[PDB]
């Protein structure tokens, strides 16, 4: 499906590349928000189909971040 931003913030780093298999709860990327570094976990096991955001990009709540196969 699709992993969206739980909150507004700035992408600090992307932890995965397209095509990489991930597990439930594995960090997909990191968002700098409210003087915290929020690691966004993958809702389920699967493969990374696409990465919708870039490091340095500002995002808002609900914005699509990663797409799994």
């Amino acid at each position: 499906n699709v992993v969206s931003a739980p909150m507004p913030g700035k992408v600090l780093r992307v932890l995965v590349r397209v095509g990489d298999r991930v597990r439930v709860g594995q960090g997909l990327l990191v968002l700098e928000a409210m003087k915290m570094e929020n690691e966004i976990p993958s809702p389920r096991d699967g493969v990374v189909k696409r990465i919708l955001v870039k490091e340095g990009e500002a995002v808002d709540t609900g914005q699509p971040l990663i797409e799994l196969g």
Binding site: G27, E32, A33, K35, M36, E37, N38, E39, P41
Partner: protein, 235 residues
């Protein structure tokens, strides 16, 4: 055997001779709130904003599991809790520490400690690295370098955890108090440069209730800086 007498932070403490990062372990393990992860040395220490943090033997490298359950607007103050705890501990040891907005503590303008807060779901991890008796990077300092002799590491640990517990309980009661403690303990009045898009110069004069750094430009105009959004440099 540690004899800690805290209410939440320090109820349990997990020690490691060595580890990659205490923050990672605190994030990937299920742990009761207040659990403290500490290690003699860290080989993969995490700094904020993708920086690396040197963690040789002799220093205090720890992470605290927290479950504040507060509104999003109060989350920016968590880093401050860690910074102020360090300031208070340094004070007990007769060391004058100041906060370099928003997560570092300086003594005579040399970094002696750094704070990093990480979140992963409901879980929040407060990470703190304090130079005690360890070797430090050029331009930094430590308690041993300030005092002129070895400092009892466990006593520093006991002091810091005890201050953090009190600050945390106070935060739970009224999350607005920490802001004033920060304002009265941070480096203010210094001229700074904001780089990137819309570059400008001004005097760092205070923080707002979100922890945003307030900058007073020469024109009297006022601008607020969001951490991680722009680069800041002292002039």
């Amino acid at each position: 055997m540690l004899g800690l007498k805290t209410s939440i932070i320090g109820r349990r403490v997990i020690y490691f001779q060595e580890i990659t990062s205490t923050n990672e372990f605190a994030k990937t393990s299920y742990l009761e709130e207040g659990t403290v992860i500490v290690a003699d040395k860290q080989t993969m220490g995490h700094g904020a904003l993708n920086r690396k943090w040197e963690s040789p033997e002799g220093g205090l490298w720890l992470s605290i599991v927290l479950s504040p359950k507060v509104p999003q607007k109060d989350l920016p103050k968590i880093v401050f809790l860690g910074a102020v705890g360090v300031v208070e501990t340094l004070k007990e040891f007769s060391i004058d520490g100041r906060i370099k907005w928003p997560n570092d503590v300086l003594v005579n303008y040399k970094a002696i400690a750094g704070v990093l807060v990480e979140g992963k779901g409901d879980k929040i991890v407060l990470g703190i690295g304090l130079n005690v008796n360890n070797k430090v990077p050029n331009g930094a300092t430590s308690m041993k370098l300030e005092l002129g002799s070895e400092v009892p590491l466990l006593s520093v640990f006991r002091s810091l955890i005890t201050n953090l517990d009190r600050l945390y309980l106070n935060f739970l009661k009224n999350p607005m108090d920490i802001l004033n403690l920060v304002r009265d303990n941070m480096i203010l009045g210094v001229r700074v440069k904001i780089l990137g898009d819309g570059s400008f110069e001004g005097i760092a004069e205070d923080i707002d209730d979100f922890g945003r750094l307030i900058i007073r430009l020469d024109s009297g105009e006022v601008k607020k800086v969001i951490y991680g959004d722009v680069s800041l440099r002292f002039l």
